[PDB]
């Protein structure tokens, strides 16, 4: 039994975004479903719940915000006229003893700024070394990394994402590997932007 | 109206083996019907305890929940680093009349004994300085407790208004936190002056670390 959330998306002030919760494993015939949301840094807020007959139950504030449906195996989250209250980590959750399944998350951008891919520049090595990648510029949230395709994992630390005063994002992804490695591994960091459809691979080096 | 969790405190702590206890007050009574999750740094939520004191499947036993009512305690046991994350009740008492609110969540904190940082500074790239900005980068890796302070001067002339730190959560492993200082700067400033030096003062080093470059060199 699992459930996934999609359709995050940066979308325009007063655009109504539709939200799908796909379910697997269990019947919307057989349980409820909840949307609950969480806006960076902040705390989980719910939003409402669909009972397997039908019936919609909404958060004091969601009433007439948000619309929940749902087919024979989704669930559908309106948001009727997006704000920038709205920018959020969308979950869906299924209901038996409090909310026991849950999706990854579907992030929410309202903003009238354009969306624009990142420049990743390295962070070169100057018996422990540090290297990185900076991600540069870029917007809407999110951005990953891994590194070596995901072969390298060990002492990798991806920093939170900063907002800009120039209203983009900006990050770095940094890991430390033996000093001796530098001379004869190759580090390469992966950094995908889906909203721009940026996936980057640079190979960070000493610089002769 | 919606019923109202109000959780404290806001952030709990203790060391390595040791128990925190986290409350909730419900602005009604609810009975038994509360819930808890765990939710660590990227992740959805986790479900630990529902009907107030029944434990998720796969759910250490570590993880404790009591009360009924208006009052209810969560309780973590043997604390891991592992744990450091934010904790969240929720009601679902006749949530067709009070709604399903969560509590505002409440931060662990694993304390462990101090860890100074190994810090590291990276000049901008090359291929950046066509941009017209350069970014200058001061590392502090797996340091503990998260108090740092990070200086940064060009020329010997402390600088402020032009950095932003980021700091990821406590390792899982280890308890310990990572620091990025990111100094920015136009091309044209940055090709102006030569050295650019980042001290770090923290518990864990008995006199600050400097790491510096020259540009250039």
């Known amino acids: ?208 | 109206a919606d019923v109202v969790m109000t959780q404290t405190p806001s952030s709990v702590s203790a060391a390595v083996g040791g128990t925190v206890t986290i409350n909730c007050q419900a602005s009604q009574s609810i009975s038994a019907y509360l819930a808890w999750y765990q939710q660590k740094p990227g992740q959805p939520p986790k479900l630990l305890i529902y009907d107030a004191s029944d434990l998720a499947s796969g759910v250490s036993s570590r993880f404790k929940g009591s009360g009924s009512g208006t009052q209810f305690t969560l309780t973590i046991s043997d604390l891991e680093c592992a744990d450091a994350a934010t904790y969240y009740c929720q009601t679902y008492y006749a949530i067709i009349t009070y709604g399903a609110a969560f509590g505002g969540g409440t931060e662990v904190v694993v304390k462990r004994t101090v860890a100074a940082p190994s810090v590291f500074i990276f000049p901008p790239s090359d291929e950046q300085l066509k941009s017209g900005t350069a970014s200058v980068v001061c590392l502090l890796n797996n340091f503990y407790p998260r108090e740092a302070k990070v200086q940064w001067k060009v020329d010997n002339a402390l600088q402020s208004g032009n950095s932003q730190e980021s700091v990821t959560e406590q390792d899982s492993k280890d308890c310990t936190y990572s620091l990025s200082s990111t100094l920015t700067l136009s091309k044209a400033d940055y090709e102006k002056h030569k050295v650019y030096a980042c001290e770090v003062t923290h518990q864990g080093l008995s006199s600050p670390v400097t790491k510096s470059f020259n540009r250039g060199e």
């Open chain 1, 1 to 208: 039994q699992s459930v996934e959330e999609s359709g995050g998306r940066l979308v325009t002030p007063g655009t109504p975004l539709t939200l799908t919760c796909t379910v697997s494993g269990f019947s919307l015939s057989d349980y409820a479903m909840s949307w609950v949301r969480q806006a960076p840094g902040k705390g989980l807020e719910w939003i409402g719940i669909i009972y397997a007959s039908g019936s919609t139950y909404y958060a004091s504030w969601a009433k007439g915000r948000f619309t929940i449906s749902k087919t024979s195996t989704t669930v559908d989250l309106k948001i009727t006229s997006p704000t920038t209250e709205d920018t959020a980590t969308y979950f869906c959750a299924r209901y038996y003893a409090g909310s026991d399944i849950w999706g990854p998350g579907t992030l929410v951008t309202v903003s009238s700024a354009s969306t624009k891919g990142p420049s990743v520049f390295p962070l070169a090595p100057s018996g422990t070394a540090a290297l990185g990648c900076l991600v540069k510029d870029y917007f809407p949230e999110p951005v990953t990394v891994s590194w070596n395709s995901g072969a390298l994992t060990s002492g990798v630390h991806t920093f939170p994402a900063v907002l800009q005063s120039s209203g983009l994002y900006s990050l770095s992804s940094v890991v430390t590997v033996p000093s001796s490695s530098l001379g004869t591994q190759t580090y390469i960091c992966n950094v995908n932007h889906k909203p721009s459809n940026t996936k980057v691979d640079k190979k960070v080096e000493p610089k002769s």
